Paper text:
SSNA1 is a fibrillar protein involved in dynamic microtubule remodeling, including nucleation, co-polymerization, and microtubule branching. Although SSNA1 is only a small 14 kDa protein mostly comprised of a coiled-coil domain, it grows into long fibrils through a self-assembly process. In vitro studies have characterized SSNA1 as a microtubule-binding protein that facilitates the nucleation of microtubules. Although its precise role has been enigmatic, SSNA1 is essential for cell integrity, and it is highly conserved across eukaryotic species from algae to humans.
We however note that three point mutations (R18E/R20E/Q98E, 3E) were introduced to facilitate structure determination, as the wild-type C. elegans SSNA-1 formed bundled filaments unsuitable for analysis. Within each fibril of the filament, individual protomers were arranged in double-stranded coiled-coils and longitudinally connected to adjacent coiled-coil units via triple-stranded helical junctions. Interestingly, the C-terminal helix of each protomer unit forms an overhang and reaches into the adjacent double-stranded helical arrangement creating a triple-stranded junction. The overhanging C-terminus of the first coiled-coil (CC1-a1) forms a triple-stranded helix with two alpha helices of the second coiled-coil (CC2). The key residues in the triple-helical junction are the N-terminal residues Y15, R18E, L19 of one strand and the C-terminal residues L89, Y97, Y105 of the partnering coiled-coil helix. While residues R18E and R20E were oriented towards the inner lumen, residue Q98E was located at the interfilamentous interfaces. These negative charges likely act as a repulsive force to separate the SSNA-1 bundles into 8-stranded filaments, making it amenable to our structural analysis.
Author numbering:
A (entry chain C): 7 to 43
B (entry chain D): 44 to 105
Write the structure that this text describes.
Amino acid sequence: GSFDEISQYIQELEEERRLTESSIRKMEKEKSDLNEK
Amino acid sequence: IDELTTRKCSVDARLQAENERAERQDRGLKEAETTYAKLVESQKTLVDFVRKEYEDTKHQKY
């Protein structure tokens, strides 16, 4: 039973990992916007 | 320019901090997804002696 519950939360955490990357890439674009101005 | 520099520092501070915060969880999940293979063997192992306990009773029936 613990095999599936732990693995399911890993995917949710891995989903958050992609979400963090999206914010990171957007922050670089926001940084580029600040650089241009 | 100070407002933009403060904005640049605010963005850059979060930018690098989020990268470290994300990579520490990402590399931890790389071991966690490998632990899923261990959990696959764990599920295999736990059910194995459960059937052995059944087999501990089953061969007694013979």
